[PDB]
């Protein structure tokens, strides 16, 4: 869809691999405001919004907090306290028809500036002069939208650009599994546990929903692994005086 009708999709309650997102393809623009790209996977937030729109190359710079222009004031606005990323790449191959692609349109003027994260869909005729116009376009009265001159022979400043903006607990990406060892005391960390000791097998019978196991004096003595549902024991490797 066009910039004047930018689509928004909500992401929640699923695992997102942020690092793989940059490695999927090549993006000419990748700017994150308030977000560290290195620690992109090291985040855990609640609400994710992916706003996307098509603009030309020269309008890419207007997609940032505290920016001014036709698109920034009439098509899409980013709040000054925006906490997210801006990703853009050229789309002159699949998103550029041969000869004045008229499918994409943009807004040129309005009665007031757009609030952040607000979309305008009205097609009311804009009154640009004292002479009134009632549903009729003409003198001092023009359509709020104009067609893009998307041509393959146009320069990179006018070439089409599809821009994806990511705006930010149920959204996080876990990793780092590892194999298992036996009959040798090591340092272990299951989901929410830590301690040192040796792990062997056991003959205890659990219940279909129990994970840990505690003896008297509140000390762990049995753990179930979350990969093969196999019981285990925990005894500490030796210590004593000299």
């Amino acid at each position: 869809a066009s910039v004047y009708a930018w689509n928004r999709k909500r992401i929640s309650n699923c695992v997102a691999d942020y690092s793989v997102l940059y490695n999927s393809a090549s993006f000419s623009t990748f700017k994150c405001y308030g977000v560290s790209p290195t620690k992109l996977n090291d985040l855990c937030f609640t609400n994710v919004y992916a706003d996307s729109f098509v603009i030309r190359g020269d309008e890419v710079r207007q997609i940032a907090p505290g920016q001014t222009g036709k698109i920034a004031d009439y098509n899409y606005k980013l709040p000054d306290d925006f906490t997210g990323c801006v990703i853009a790449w050229n789309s002159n191959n699949l998103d550029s028809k041969v000869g004045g692609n008229y499918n994409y349109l943009y807004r040129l003027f309005r009665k007031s500036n757009l609030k952040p994260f607000e979309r305008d869909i009205s097609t009311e005729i804009y009154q640009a002069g004292s002479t009134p116009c009632n549903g009729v376009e003409g003198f001092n009265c023009y359509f709020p939208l104009q067609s893009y001159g998307f041509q393959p022979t146009n320069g990179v400043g006018y070439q089409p650009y599809r821009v994806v903006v990511l705006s930010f607990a149920t959204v996080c990406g876990p990793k780092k599994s590892t194999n298992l060892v036996k009959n040798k005391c090591v340092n272990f960390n299951f989901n929410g546990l830590t301690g040192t000791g040796v792990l062997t097998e056991s003959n205890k019978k659990f219940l279909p929903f129990q994970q840990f196991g505690r003896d008297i004096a509140d000390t762990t003595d049995a753990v179930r692994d979350p990969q093969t549902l196999e019981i285990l024991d925990i005894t500490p490797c030796s210590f004593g005086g000299v």
Partner: nanobody
Framework: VQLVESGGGLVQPGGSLRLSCAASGRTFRVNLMGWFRQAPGKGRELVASINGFDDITYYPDSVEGRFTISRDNAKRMVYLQMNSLRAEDTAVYYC??????????????WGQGTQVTVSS
């Protein structure tokens, strides 16, 4: 390019009515139609607007919850289903076809128009 409008006669308040117009001739650069309303004592007004490229329809607050617009790309058809008709809807309905110049300025084609009356 020629806009021919069909349908729309005399109806009763609280009824339903659908209007369809066909565009034939030169292919339009921009996929954008619309419906207009001209009251006998007032000027042209906005009823609905559909793009098709984005599949997003816009309605004014006056008829946001009563007027629905649909399009048929294969037959070059557009439809405007009118529900919960009131006495204020008695006007002539027009069809608009939007085209663009080489520079990019959007044009507009005005149809013949169909008279719609809501009488008890």
């Amino acid at each position: 390019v020629q806009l021919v409008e069909s349908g729309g006669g005399l109806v009763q308040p609280g009824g339903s009515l659908r209007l369809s117009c066909a565009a034939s001739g030169r292919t339009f650069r921009v996929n954008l139609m619309g419906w207009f309303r001209q009251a006998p004592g007032k000027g042209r007004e906005l009823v609905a607007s559909i793009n098709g490229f984005d599949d997003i329809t816009y309605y004014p607050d006056s008829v946001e919850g009563r007027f629905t617009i649909s399009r048929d790309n294969a037959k070059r058809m557009v439809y405007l289903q009118m529900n919960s008709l009131r006495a204020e809807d008695t006007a002539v309905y027009y069809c608009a076809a939007y085209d663009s110049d080489y520079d990019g300025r959007l044009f507009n084609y005005w149809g013949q128009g169909t008279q719609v009356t809501v009488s008890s």
